[PDB]
Structures are given as C-alpha cells and as structure tokens.
C-alpha cells in the first residue's frame, strides 16, 4: 500500500515479480481504460494496483486468464 | 653506433652530411654535362 | 536494429573503401568569406552529406520530389542533416604505412609473426638498412638484415636473383609471402622434441597466435595500411563561437598534415626526385600517420600551436576521461536538481521535504499534461504562459501531480547501495531539502553545508521499483552484516536516557499508580518527577504458541519515566525492555527485538515514535554545557609533582653512569604512562559517581547527573578519551614520524596549553589530517577494482546439488574466543549433516537455513565444528545457486533468484575502507582451568621425567567441561613440557619451557659421545678462556671450511662401552645423529651427556592496514616466502654447487626424487629425513597464497584469505560477513591451466576458464572418452578482471589499447553476458527486474 | 674500483662518451664534443650559481 509493500511481496514471492505484475496491471488501468476492482480513494494507478494485489484479486495467473478470455471473445466476433 | 635516434631530423642530417660541397668548378662541370646530355637527345 | 553480439577484426583495404562515400583530396576546410565548405576538402557536402536539411547548394532539385537523387551541378544530395554524423571518407596513401598499434604495443604482433626482434623492424622501416625477402640462390636467406654497403657488395656480385627491400614495403612483402600452415606444423613438431622452459613457452604463445590468426580469417597483410579512413565531420566539428572566432577539434589538424604530406609525396614521385628526398618524405608520412593514430607513443608528441600535445583518436578512447568511463558508463541526466540539506524532525520515515520551486521545475511536462486535460489551457504555449506567471491553479495541479510520486535522493560519494533512496515528497517553501533525521547514518550526512541531488523516476515500472525496492522503509537492515541501520542517535539517545534514569527520594517516592496514564497525568501536573521510584500496574502481552497474544497483568516496581515511555512500545514485547536506564545499545537492541518478533510495519511506526519522544524529552530536560562541568581532580598536582621529582632523580642517577640512554628513556616513558593512568582514574572516580543524597535520613551515594558524564554514559556523543583530554592530562605526544616525546603535556583544555605544548600537538594534528585526505583515494581505487572483478555473479539456480562445503569452527586465536559460531554460521546452509549419536544425539537435518532457533539449539547442545555449504564450492556454471549462498542479509530470508551478488559484495567490502587506518615469549601459561589435549605431537621421555617434543607442528588446546576449545597455542620445536596429556591443568600454570634465543637439539638417551668427522682447524676452532679454562667447540660451515676438510659432515655417535647401538624396536633406522653445520657442543669430545641436555645452541635472532588488504586481494608474493614440503618421503641435502643448497626429497613409496634449490643464507628448520607431508612448512617467514593453493587445496586458500582479511577489519571494530570475501575469492580463482593430452582441442600450457573445462570434460565423460587434467590458478584482482571472456568489459576497465589489439587480432566475439556490457549498449541488465526479460530471450535461442 | 670498471682511457674518448650520451645518434667530432662540454658546465651564459 502507501507506506510499505510487505504484504504484496508476501503474497507473490519475488519482489521483482511483484514489480513486473503490478506494472502491467497499472498500465492496463491507466491507458487500457479498465475499471479498478477496489475503490479509488483518490489514488494513483500504481497504488491501486498494489492494493488489488495485496488482497488477492490480481495476480499473474488471473491477468493471463482475463487477457486470453478477452482475446478469444474479440476473435469470435 | 646508432643510439636508436628515432628523431627524423637526425636521420636527415646524418644522411645529408656525407655529400661534400664543391664550388666554382663542379657547377660548371655538371652544367656542361647536363647541356651535353640535352644536346645529345 | 536488434542484435545479439559484437565482433571485432582487422579491416581489409577493400572494406575501408566499402565504408567510404568518397575520398578526401584537399586539406581545405571552409571558405574564408562565405563559410560554406570546399569542394573536396575535409568538410565537403558531396561526400559527407548536406549541411542544411533538404536543400542543395543550387536548389534546383527541391521540394522533396527528389529523395536520394543527387543534384549533379552542385554535387549535393537532398536529404536530412544527420548524415553528416555517420558518413565516412577515405584517403589513399601513396606508400604503405605500418599501423602503430600492431607494431609498438608490446609484445609487437608483427614481431611475433615474423620472429624478428623489434629493433630490426625499426631499422628496416626508417630506411636505415635493407632486408632480404627472397634469396633463391643459396648465399642468403629470408629475414636477414643487410647493411647499406653490404647490399652493394651482394648486388654487384650476384644480382638478378636477389630481392632486398627497405621500409614498410619490405615488411608488407614479408608478411604477404609467409605461409601460416607450414610454421604451424613445424612448430607443432618442434615442441615435441625439446622443451627448454623459456623456449617451450615462447613457442606455445607463437603457435597460439598463428592458430588463432588462421581461424579468425584475417590475413597478416592487413596489419599495414594502404587506405586510411576519415571520421565523419560532425564528430570533429568546426563551429563558430559567438565572438566571431572559430573552435575546432585537433583531429582536423592531424588529418590536414597527413593529407599534405601525402599530396607532396605524390608530387615528388611524379617529378622523379633523388632518393634521399623521397626517403625523407616517406618517413614523414609514416610519422604523420603514427601521430594521427596514437600521439606520443612514437617518442615525441606533436604539440599544437599553443604548447601542448594534440589529442588523437586513441586519446579519445583510453583514459579516465575517454568515452568508456565518461560518456558510456555514467552520463549527465535530465529531470534532476540539487540543493543544500536541512533537518526536518516532523517527517515520517518515508517522506522528504521538497522546495516548491524545484518541484515546479522538475515536474514541468506532467503539469502541462494535466493543465490541458482539465481544459484550463487550450494549447501547450498557453500552458507555458500559465506556468511562468505562477497562477493559483498551477499550484493546485502541482499538488495533485506529486501525490504518490516518489523521488530519488542521492549524496555523493555513493559508497554503498544505501546512498540512493526513494522518498515521498512533501512540498515546502524555502530552498533547502529537508531530510529525515534517522536516515543520516546511512547517507553519512551531517547538516553543515552538504548538498544532495534529486532525480525523478518517470515510467510506471520506474515508479513501482522506487516504491518496492528502494523506498526508505524497506531498507532497515544493512546488507553487509545483518544489523539494523535505522539507529537512534545523539539527541534521541540523550532524551531517552534522561527520561529513563532514576534518582533518590525526589518527588513522589513510593506512590502506587494505576498504569502509565496516571504517571503522565502526575508528571505533567508537577506532582511528581520523572525520576521517582514508584509502583505501577502494568499489563504486558506475550505471543502464544500459535501467534496469539496472551495478556498478563501485574504490579511492578519502576519509575515515572519508564511508565510514561511504556505507552509507545507495541504490544508483544516484555516489560523488561523498558525497565532499565536506556543507553544507545539498549535502544538499538529494542528495535532489533521488535523487528524479529513483530515484523516490519510495527518497527517502522515504533522507530518514528522513539524519535519523537526522544526529541521532546531531551528538550524538556534542558541539558547544557558550562565550564564548571569539567571537574579536575583535587590531587592532580600531587601526582604531577611526584612524577616530576622521581624523573628528576632517575636523570640525576644517570650521570653516575649507572644508566645508559636506552634505560633512561624507557624508564621515563614508563613513569609518565603510570602517572597518566593514575590521573585519569582519579578524574573518573571523582566525576562518575559523585552525588551524595539524603534518603529521608542519612546519606546515600548514586551516579551523578553531570551533563558531560551524561553524554559519556548515554553513548550520545562523548567518549572516555575525550573527557580525559578535557579534565585530565592531554598525555604524551609523538614527534613527526615515530618517536614519542619524553616530557608529556601535563595541561588540559580547561587549564589551557602554553606555546610550546601547542606547537608540539600540531605535529600529530596535521599528520592525521593529511592521512585522511590522502587515504580516501586509495579506498576508492580498491573498491573500483573489487566491483569490476565480481560483477557477473548473479543467483541463477536453486540447488546445484553439490556435497562440498567448508568446515567452520570458532576462531580461538591466542587465549580468548574472538568469534563464536552464532555470528559465524547464522544464515548459512548446512551440507552433509553432522550427527553425534552418543553424548548429544546431534540431529541436524540436511540443507536447512540456520534460523535463530537452530542456532540456539546448537548453543544449548554446545557443538563446535559445523560443515557449511559455501559459494567457492558451488557447482553451477556462470552463477551460484541460492542454497550455496544462504540468507539475503538485508531482507532476511533465503536469497531470491536473480539478484546481483557480486556488486553487493564488492561494495560491502570497500565501504569501510575509509575509516580503516592508513616480548615475554619465555613460556606458555594457561589462563583458565581445563584439560589439555595435544594434537600431532611427537614426544620423548627423558631422565628428568619431562616430555620433550620433536614434532615440528605441535598444538596446545584447552577442553572445557562441556567439550569445547577455549585456548590454543603453538608449541615450538624442542620445548620442554611440564605435564602430560589428560590431566586437568590449573589457571595460571606454565606448561612448557624452552630457550627463546636458541633452538636446542635435545638428547633422548645417555652414553658415550664420539665426535665424528669433525677435526680442529678444519671443522671447529679452539677456544681458550681464563684461569677456569672452560673450552667450547663451534662447528665452522662449508663457507669457511678448508678444501681438505670439505667432505667431513659433523655428527655425534652415541656409543656404549662395547660400541654397539641398540636398535629402536620394530624400526630399522640406524642411530646416526648427523647434526648439520654449527652444532655448537661446548663440552669436549668424550663427555657424558644426560638425556634431555642441550647438544647445540643455534640462536634464532607487518604492514597491517589498507595496503595489507590491498595486497591480500592482489595476491602479491611476500619477499621472503616460507618454503613448503612438496612430496612426502625422505629428506636430505645433496651436492652443493657454487653454494646452491641442494635439497633432495626422495619419497618413501614414490620413486621419483624431487630436488629444490635453496638460498644460501636462509636457514632450514628440518635437519634430515623426516616424515614431512604435502605442504609441510620447512622454512620461516610469510606464506604465499599461490603455494597454499597448489599444495593444500582451494579450501585452504579460502580460509587463509578470509582469516587474514578479517583480522584487519576486526582490529578496527568493523563487522563484515565472511560471505562477501568468499564471493571475491571465488571470482579470483576463475582460470585453470591444462597439463595433459585429453580428448578435446587443448594443449600443454594453455590457460582456459575452469567452467569451459568442466563443460568439455563432462561432455566427453558422457561418451566414455577421458578428458584433460587441469590445475586451478590464482590471479590477482587486476589480472583476473583483465582476463575475462569479453573485450568490452576488459576494455572499459583498464589498458584499453592492449586489450583492443589482442581482440582485434584474434577476431573475438562478445556475447553480452555481464552487467557492464549491457549498461554500455543501453539495455536491461540481467539482474533483478530485468532478469526475467533475458530468460525469455534465452528460450528464443531454442526457436532459432 | 670505478676506474677498473671505467671503459674510457683518455680525455678525448671521455668527451666522446659524454657527447654520445647527451646527443645520441650523431657523429662525435672533436670540436662538437669540446664545445658541448664547455657550454654544458663552464660557460657564463649557460650556467649560473647565483
Ligand atoms: Mg559535513
Ligand atoms: Zn543543387
Ligand atoms: Zn551451489
């Protein structure tokens, strides 16, 4: 979260993996125009991504599944 | 004796020092021979 | 665009023409009125591109209709301007010219190919003598130097078959004609017959050059230039300065003179000049080319117009200020600022105060973007005008921008990775940056004029890794050792000390309080004091078996201050933490406990609250410093007068001649030292515990509340020595260099020094100050070398699966335990578990991380030696596995895959460098009680019943009741003992006795003594004494031995009445005690010697600083190395040659005899045939690491280097984990040398990477075939770093020209593995965050 | 001992030795060596101990 990022690291493992995952999710939020899962509370996209990861919503597996589903649906139409 | 004097100026002066000057007679001698060669050709 | 590798090779002339766009024929640059460029000059627009974008000189072909079309009339192509930065030209030399790099850069590759001494090529090139290319007729041969007249002599006779030339044409003709295959095979054969070591190695290196030179596809002809390339104009600009003048680079000048000489040479040849003139021109052309390529290496540097040498291409690459270090490895940066720092005590640990103006400037484009988003500005120019006039909406937008955006704060020099940290900004007014007090220690910053630099991370990934990896709340432990770095300091410590301490009866004795809240309500109302001793009811919490917090309530005895402090402490910790007067150590331990019990977040909040409370109560204490606070003992002058009178009497006694100079000097120094100690102790006694208080009645005695004493105890700022100087005596001083002045300084700073004493102290002051000033540079250079050696290390695997390790024991140097296990094994992985069924039933499971709990288990079971997995033994290629490393000290767990170990190790070792500086040997005395256990001891009983030792290496220990070693000692050879093995010795007892200034040959038996092969006059000298008439026999050595008595080897026969010697049981050795030279037997021949008596008396009569560690890591050879025993067996002397001591070791079982030359004046420890093993020491002196590695093995050299580096740091109280030194040693054992014919393409004497050999060997052993045999080499830091498999890394490090030449000749290929390589080429490093990226590219190698 | 190691024999050879040490690579004529030594240490305008 805002102060310390300990819980997210504990949730994912590597710090480096955390950085990469949260970066791609934040890019998604910023420019891809998606809707944050957790409330805004007037936060940058970076901290919103970290709070999403913190409580188990966003993770590399989930992001991959979501993107594959979107691509499948897009190609269907 | 050459102390590996890499200075090109030294090499030039050493090479040019050998040939010795000669005046008032040679110049006439060489000029005559030059003109003789030109006349021959 | 995308690439994979970089390769280097020589350039063929047709290649150089391939690069070119046209050739440069005139030396003109630009026109003097209209500054347009000239037709074929150095700046032509036709060949190097157009000056102004999309516009040729005439402009007939314009308006982007013609793209790439050349306008014919002006010759100017219509394209972009950037091409002037990348198009090249060329120059066609009239005479071939040698390339200086391949001629002078030693070992002179041209010399190696042709096998000619350098001076011969020199004499040929400078037109001083001829050389024979081809003698078909048998008279002459190839590469024979011919003098001037000698060529005339050979031509006039022979002629028409005689090819001799002179100058660079000759050298090129020699290289062009020489066929590589022939010499390759011939030298291959030649090594097969005779190997003279020097000849053998020179042939190996020449064969290496030829084989590589054939492989690479280069041809030797290309070492000599015929076409020369010309660098693009915009990299050597000619620009107009504002004042009307012009500024130019030097390459313009050098190119101009090359072109001038070349043009005039063409003119001369066209004109048919005499030969001396053309020879002159040819030399000057060659010199001009040499000065172009590398100035000053040809001896005399061409100076510019001014005074100074012109700077050439090689100069643009090489130095500290060349491209490599100054523009590629580190460069100036946008989005950055700089200013003075100041303390902000109200901040939270993750914040920094940023001035409004700096913030407005740094975040400019972000502000433009959000001004446009909200519609407040239509266009960017409107946004500019909005910002420059600073409207209020701009400040609102800025406040919205910086929120959640971290910035990076840096303070140079950046010694370790904590010198850069990321903070969250708070906008302030003013112009100074506000820094949180707790992070000053990490930065090494003090607020007296320092400055720091601010950088802005831009992308989302940069922001995230500033928040996750770099944020200040993530760095609380140091990566060098595990201890925390957030450590409260001066004012915080003073406040907490004052708040906690207790006092006698003062207000509010013996009240009873319902918890801390009442304590605060009492103190702040003036009803009680912070120091009252009160009884308070307190509820602690304690973490349960499954993490639950059980609550326990009790009634404790404490003070008001401690009760108030308790309100801060997070729940989970015991009350005992707060219940004593806190110093610095106590506070740091409090934080450490909170960390290892509760986690990270509670410790962060707790650290803040400690800081806030410490400031508040330090201020309320009102501690100050007056001059009355430095008390002086009432009896100082008495001590001084007594010492003065006593020294006066010793000096008076000197003139009686009873005392020499050395005696008097030493005595006086001892006297003054004793007086100093008495004065200091009296001062501390008067100061420390001087307060007498009434305890409701009679008197009481307590520690004092003197302010300077408070600053001493609390550990806030003072120390004992400083206070000694303030109130005692200043002490003794030293003359400029070594000598310590006789009369000390009796005055102190309160009393004031006088003129002479001040002048005396100035010496030491200036010496120390200059030391620091000139020590910083050495520290920096050392750390740079260390960083460059070990950068490629990254954690790559999870488990190499190796079974090796290092056995580790606590260090028991001398008498006392320097280091226990728990400091030395914590956080490492145990390999090949040590079990002890029996006394302790020791169970250590495989491959476990040693937590604190496991260490506690080890302590209570009290085990001493543990084998531990270590980096130097890891089996992974191109990296180390996580398990062989251990903890990540900064974080606290098993280390993550992909982290850059090598840089961390180098930084952690090099960081403390700045603070690092620059005989009663009679017997052996045990300190504490215990039991004796000897090891490797050869004992012999004498008649006195005393154990005499003859073993060379005898070690003394002290086993305690629980079975640990508490002491260790080295028993010298021939030392008499006191007690045997097994019995318990007593504290203070002496166990051994020997003669210090003597090595005696001790007797074992009795009987008659026969003096054999020793004659008087030939071998010994007659010595006559006075009336008593006691004579002594002294054996003369072969140095002064006469020629007739040379074969006489002195010896002592031990015979009985019959002469027959009884043989030792079971052993067949003859009793032939051949004592070596100078066996001084005072007793004459035929004297009964008792067992245990002295036969001979041969007497036996340290940098330690930053240079010491620099020499340890550089693997330098000590001047006087100890010699080691190579092969076990029998030892003897042999036949001396010119005095060459001849040492012959014939093995007991091995057949081959091994001979060693020995220096004449060096002594030998061993006498004759002994049982000496691998690397048994035989001489005395410093030991060389190379020998350690060759003989004892790799673990031995690692242990040696670790120990002797760590001594230097321990002596200064600097704690570094051994793991980092192990890493550096690993990187320092990289190469191996091959001694075998294997199955692969290797050779005798080649040096190749140990990993490469492992790969080839395992590959062949998967196929049955036998691989080659190798032996590892140990190389210094600089060597090992210069010998990597990558010319970019080595070239950026040091010695650029040499490594570029070797790489160019050998046709190397760089595959871009390291970190420096990717940094230079502008890519993601293969470590940390970037790691994953490269591994993807790795699997792309599968699909290619 | 220095005399025994000393290779030169007379004055002129000594001047030649000095001359070819100071200016290597030039023929050591009589007058050149003489002038070099004099100007080297004993000439008013080329040496001054103030
Ligand atoms: Mg300062
Ligand atoms: Zn045109
Ligand atoms: Zn390993």
Curated annotation (Swiss-Prot), chain A:
Gene Ontology molecular function: bacterial-type RNA polymerase core enzyme binding; DNA binding; DNA-directed RNA polymerase activity
Its biological purpose: Promotes RNA polymerase (RNAP) assembly. Latches the N- and C-terminal regions of the beta' subunit thereby facilitating its interaction with the beta and alpha subunits.
GO cellular component: cytosol; cytosolic DNA-directed RNA polymerase complex; RNA polymerase complex; transcription elongation factor complex
E.C. number: 2.7.7.6
Alphabetical keyword list: DNA-directed RNA polymerase, Nucleotidyltransferase, Transcription, Transferase
Keyword Transcription carried by entry: yes
Keyword Nucleotidyltransferase: yes
Lineage: Bacteria, Pseudomonadati, Pseudomonadota, Gammaproteobacteria, Enterobacterales
Family: Belongs to the RNA polymerase subunit omega family.
Catalytic activity: RNA(n) + a ribonucleoside 5'-triphosphate = RNA(n+1) + diphosphate
The protein's name: DNA-directed RNA polymerase subunit omega
Quaternary structure note: The RNAP catalytic core consists of 2 alpha, 1 beta, 1 beta' and 1 omega subunit. When a sigma factor is associated with the core the holoenzyme is formed, which can initiate transcription. The rRNA transcription and antitermination complex (rrnTAC) consists of RNAP, NusA, NusB, NusE (rpsJ), NusG, SubB, ribosomal protein S4, DNA and precursor rRNA; S4 is more flexible than other subunits.
Enzyme class: transferase
GO biological process, one term: transcription antitermination
Portion of the parent chain present: 2 to 78 of 91
From Swiss-Prot, chain B:
Locations listed in the record: Cytoplasm
Segments forming a coiled coil: none
Subunit structure: Interacts transiently with the RNA polymerase catalytic core formed by RpoA, RpoB, RpoC and RpoZ (2 alpha, 1 beta, 1 beta' and 1 omega subunit) to form the RNA polymerase holoenzyme that can initiate transcription. Identified in a complex containing RpoD, the RNA polymerase subunits RpoA, RpoB and RpoZ, CRP and DNA. Interacts with Rsd; this prevents interaction with the RNA polymerase catalytic core and with promoter DNA, and as a consequence, promotes transcription from promoters that require alternative sigma factors.
Protein's job: Sigma factors are initiation factors that promote the attachment of RNA polymerase to specific initiation sites and are then released. This sigma factor is the primary sigma factor during exponential growth. Preferentially transcribes genes associated with fast growth, such as ribosomal operons, other protein-synthesis related genes, rRNA- and tRNA-encoding genes and prfB.
Recorded domain comment: Contains 4 domains, connected by flexible linkers. In the active conformation, the domains are in an extended conformation, each making extensive interactions with the RNA polymerase catalytic core.
Record family assignment: Belongs to the sigma-70 factor family. RpoD/SigA subfamily.
Protein name: RNA polymerase sigma factor RpoD
Source organism (scientific name): Escherichia coli (strain K12)
Gene responsible for this protein: rpoD
From Swiss-Prot, chain C:
GO BP term, pick one: transcription antitermination
Organism: Escherichia coli (strain K12)
List of residues binding Mg(2+): 446, 448, 450
Effect of residue 768 to A/C: Resistant to antibiotics salinamide A and B
SUPFAM superfamilies in UniProt: beta and beta-prime subunits of DNA dependent RNA-polymerase
The reaction(s) this protein catalyses: RNA(n) + a ribonucleoside 5'-triphosphate = RNA(n+1) + diphosphate
Gene Ontology terms for molecular function: DNA binding; DNA-directed RNA polymerase activity; magnesium ion binding; zinc ion binding
Name the UniProt record assigns to this protein: DNA-directed RNA polymerase subunit beta'
Binding site for Zn(2+) 1: 56, 58, 71, 74
Swiss-Prot record, chain D:
Biotechnology: Co-administration of salinamide and rifampicin or salinamide and myxopyronin suppresses the emergence of resistance to both antibiotics.
Assembly notes: The RNAP catalytic core consists of 2 alpha, 1 beta, 1 beta' and 1 omega subunit. When a sigma factor is associated with the core the holoenzyme is formed, which can initiate transcription. The rRNA transcription and antitermination complex (rrnTAC) consists of RNAP, NusA, NusB, NusE (rpsJ), NusG, SubB, ribosomal protein S4, DNA and precursor rRNA; S4 is more flexible than other subunits. In pull-down experiments interacts with CedA.
Name of the protein described by the UniProt record: DNA-directed RNA polymerase subunit beta
PTM: Acetylated on several lysine residues in the presence of glucose.
Similarity comment text for this entry: Belongs to the RNA polymerase beta chain family.
Section covered of the full-length record: 349 to 398 of 1342
Superkingdom of the source species: Bacteria
Physiological role: DNA-dependent RNA polymerase (RNAP) catalyzes the transcription of DNA into RNA using the four ribonucleoside triphosphates as substrates. Resistance to the antibiotics salinamide A, salinamide B, rifampicin, streptolydigin, CBR703, myxopyronin, and lipiarmycin can result from mutations in this protein.
């Amino acid at each position: 979260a805002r102060v310390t990022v300990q819980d997210a690291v504990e949730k994912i493992g590597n710090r480096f993996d955390l950085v990469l995952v949260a970066a791609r999710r934040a890019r998604q939020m910023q420019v891809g125009g998606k809707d944050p899962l957790v409330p805004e509370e007037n936060d940058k996209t970076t901290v919103i991504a970290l709070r999403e990861i913190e409580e188990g919503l966003i993770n590399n597996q989930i992001l991959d599944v979501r993107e594959r589903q979107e691509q499948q649906e897009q190609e269907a139409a | 004796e050459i102390g590996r004097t890499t200075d090109p100026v030294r090499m030039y002066m050493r090479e040019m020092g050998t040939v010795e000057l000669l005046t008032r007679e040679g110049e006439i001698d060489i000029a005559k021979r030059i003109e003789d060669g030109i006349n021959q050709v | 665009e995308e690439f994979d590798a970089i390769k280097i090779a020589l350039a063929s002339p047709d290649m150089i023409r391939s690069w070119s766009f046209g050739e440069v024929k005139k030396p003109e640059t630009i026109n003097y009125r209209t500054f347009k460029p000239e037709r074929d000059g150095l700046f032509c627009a036709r060949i190097f591109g157009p000056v102004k974008d999309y516009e040729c000189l005439c402009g007939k072909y314009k308006r982007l209709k013609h793209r790439g079309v050349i306008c014919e009339k002006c010759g100017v192509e219509v394209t972009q301007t950037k091409v002037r930065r990348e198009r090249m030209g060329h120059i066609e030399l009239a005479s071939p010219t040698a390339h200086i790099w391949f001629l002078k850069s030693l070992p002179s590759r041209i010399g190696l190919l042709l096998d000619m001494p350098l001076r011969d090529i020199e004499r040929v090139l400078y037109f001083e003598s001829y050389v024979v290319i081809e003698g078909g007729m048998t008279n002459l041969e190839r590469q024979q130097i011919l003098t001037e007249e000698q060529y005339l002599d050979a031509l006039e006779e022979f002629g028409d078959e005689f090819d001799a030339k002179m100058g660079a044409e000759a050298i090129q003709a020699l290289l062009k004609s020489m066929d590589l295959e022939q010499e390759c095979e011939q030298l291959r054969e030649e090594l097969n017959e005779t190997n003279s070591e020097t000849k053998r190695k020179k042939l190996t290196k020449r064969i290496k050059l030829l084989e590589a030179f054939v492989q690479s596809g280069n041809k030797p002809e290309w070492m000599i230039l015929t076409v020369l390339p010309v660098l693009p104009p915009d990299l050597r600009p000619l620009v107009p300065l504002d004042g009307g003048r012009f500024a130019t680079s030097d390459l313009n000048d050098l190119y101009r003179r090359v072109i001038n000489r070349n043009n005039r040479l063409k003119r001369l040849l066209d004109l048919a000049a005499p030969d001396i003139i053309v020879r002159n021109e040819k030399r000057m052309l060659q010199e001009a080319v040499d000065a172009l390529l590398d100035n000053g290496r040809r001896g005399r540097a061409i100076t510019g117009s001014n005074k100074r040498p012109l700077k050439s291409l090689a100069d643009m690459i090489k130095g500290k200020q060349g491209r490599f270090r100054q523009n590629l490895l580190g460069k100036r940066v946008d989005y950055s600022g700089r200013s003075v720092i100041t303390v902000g005590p109200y901040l939270r640990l993750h914040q920094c105060g940023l001035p409004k103006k700096m913030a407005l400037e740094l975040f400019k484009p972000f502000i433009y973007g959000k001004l446009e988003l909200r519609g407040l500005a239509t266009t960017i120019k409107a946004a500019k005008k909005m910002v420059e006039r600073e409207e209020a909406v701009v400040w609102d937008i800025l406040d919205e921008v910086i929120r959640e955006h971290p910035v990076l704060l840096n303070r140079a020099p950046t010694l370790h990775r904590l010198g850069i940290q990321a903070f969250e900004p708070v906008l302030i007014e003013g112009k100074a940056i506000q820094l949180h007090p707790l992070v000053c220690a990490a930065y090494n910053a003090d607020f007296d004029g320092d400055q720091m630099a601010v950088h802005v991370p831009l992308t989302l990934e940069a922001q995230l890794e500033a928040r996750a990896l770099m944020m200040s709340t993530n760095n609380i432990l140091s990566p060098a050792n595990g201890e925390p770095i957030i450590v409260p300091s001066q004012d915080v410590v003073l406040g907490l000390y004052y708040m906690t301490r207790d006092c006698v009866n003062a207000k509010g004795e013996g009240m009873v309080l319902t918890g801390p809240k009442e304590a605060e309500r009492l103190y702040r109302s003036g009803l009680a004091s912070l120091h009252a001793r009160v009884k308070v009811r307190i509820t602690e919490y304690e973490k349960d078996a499954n993490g639950e917090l059980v609550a326990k309530t009790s009634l404790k005895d404490t003070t008001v201050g401690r009760a108030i402090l308790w309100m801060i402490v997070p729940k989970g910790l015991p009350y005992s933490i707060v219940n004593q007067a806190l110093g610095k150590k106590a506070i740091s331990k409090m934080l450490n406990t909170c960390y290892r019990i509760l986690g990270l977040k509670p410790t962060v909040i707790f650290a803040d609250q400690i800081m806030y409370t410490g400031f508040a109560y330090a201020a309320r204490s009102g501690a100050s410093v007056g001059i009355d606070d430095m008390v002086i003992p009432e009896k100082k002058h008495e001590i001084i007068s007594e010492a003065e009178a006593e020294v006066a009497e010793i000096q008076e006694q000197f003139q009686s001649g009873l005392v020499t100079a050395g005696e008097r000097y030493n005595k006086v120094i001892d006297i003054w030292a004793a007086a100093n100690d008495r004065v200091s102790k009296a001062m501390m006694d008067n100061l420390q515990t001087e307060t007498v208080i009434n305890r409701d009645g009679q008197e009481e005695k307590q520690v004092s509340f003197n302010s300077i004493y408070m600053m001493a105890d609390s550990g806030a700022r003072g120390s004992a020595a400083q206070i000694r100087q303030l109130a005692g005596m200043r002490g003794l001083m030293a003359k400029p260099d070594g000598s310590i002045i006789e009369t000390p300084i009796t005055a102190n700073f309160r009393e004031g020094l006088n003129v002479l004493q001040y002048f005396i102290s100035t010496h030491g002051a200036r010496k120390g100050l200059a030391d620091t000033a000139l020590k910083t540079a050495n520290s920096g250079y050392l750390t740079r070398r260390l960083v460059d050696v070990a950068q490629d290390l990254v954690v790559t695997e999870d488990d190499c699966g190796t079974h090796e390790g290092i056995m580790m024991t606590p260090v028991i140097e001398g008498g006392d335990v320097k280091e226990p296990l728990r400091d030395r094994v914590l956080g490492r992985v145990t390999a090949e578990d040590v079990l002890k069924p029996g006394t302790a039933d020791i169970l250590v499971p495989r491959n476990t991380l040693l937590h604190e709990q496991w260490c506690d288990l080890l302590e209570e079971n009290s085990v001493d030696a543990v084998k531990v997995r270590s980096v130097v033994s890891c089996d992974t290629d191109f990296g180390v596995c996580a398990h062989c490393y251990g903890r990540d000290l900064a974080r606290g767990h098993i280390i993550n895959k992909g982290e850059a170990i090598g840089v961390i190790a180098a930084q952690s070792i090099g960081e403390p460098g700045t603070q690092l500086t620059m005989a009663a040997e009679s017997s052996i005395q045990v300190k504490n009680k215990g039991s004796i256990k000897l090891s490797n001891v050869k004992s012999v009983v004498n008649s006195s019943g005393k154990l005499v030792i003859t073993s060379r290496n005898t070690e003394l220990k002290l086993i305690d009741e629980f079975g640990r070693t508490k002491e260790s000692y080295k028993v010298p050879y021939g030392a008499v003992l006191a007690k045997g093995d097994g019995e318990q010795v007593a504290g203070g007892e002496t166990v051994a006795n020997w003669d210090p200034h003597t090595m005696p040959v001790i007797t074992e038996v009795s009987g008659f003594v026969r003096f054999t092969d020793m004659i008087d006059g030939q071998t010994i000298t007659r010595q006559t004494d006075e009336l008593t008439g006691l004579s002594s026999l002294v054996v003369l050595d072969s140095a002064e031995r006469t020629a007739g008595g040379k074969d006489l080897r002195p010896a002592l026969k031990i015979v009985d009445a019959q002469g027959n010697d009884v043989l030792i049981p079971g052993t067949d050795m003859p009793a032939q005690y051949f004592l070596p030279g100078k066996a001084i037997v005072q007793l004459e021949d035929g004297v009964q010697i008792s067992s245990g008596d002295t036969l001979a008396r041969i007497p036996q009569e340290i940098t330690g600083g930053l240079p010491r560690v620099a020499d340890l890591f550089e693997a330098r050879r000590p001047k006087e190395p100890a010699i080691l025993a190579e092969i076990s067996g029998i030892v003897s002397f042999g036949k001396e040659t010119k005095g060459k001591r001849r040492l012959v070791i014939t093995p007991v079982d091995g057949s081959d005899p091994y001979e060693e030359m020995i220096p004449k004046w060096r002594q030998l420890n061993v006498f004759e045939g002994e049982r000496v093993e691998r690397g048994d020491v035989i001489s005395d002196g410093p030991e060389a690491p190379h020998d350690i590695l060759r003989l004892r093995g790799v673990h031995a050299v690692t242990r040696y280097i670790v120990n002797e580096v760590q001594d230097v740091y321990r002596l200064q109280g600097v704690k570094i984990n051994d793991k980092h030194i192990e890493v550096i040693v690993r990187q320092m054992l990289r190469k191996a040398t091959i001694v075998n014919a294997g199955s692969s393409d290797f050779l005798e004497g080649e040096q190749v990477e140990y990993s490469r050999v492992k790969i080839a060997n395992r590959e062949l052993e998967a196929n049955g075939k036998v691989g080659a045999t190798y032996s590892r080499d140990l190389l210094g830091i600089t060597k090992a770093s210069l010998a990597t498999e990558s010319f970019i890394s080595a070239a950026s490090f040091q010695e650029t020209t040499r490594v570029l030449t070797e790489a160019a000749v050998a046709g190397k290929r760089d595959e871009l593995r390291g970190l420096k390589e990717n940094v230079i080429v502008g890519r993601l490093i293969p470590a940390g965050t970037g790691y994953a990226y490269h591994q993807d590219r790795m699997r792309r190698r599968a699909a290619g | 001992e220095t005399l025994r190691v000393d290779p030169t024999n007379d004055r002129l050879s000594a001047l030649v030795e000095i001359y070819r040490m100071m200016r290597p690579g030039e023929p050591p004529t009589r007058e050149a060596a003489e002038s070099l030594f004099e100007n080297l240490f004993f000439s008013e305008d080329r040496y001054d101990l103030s």
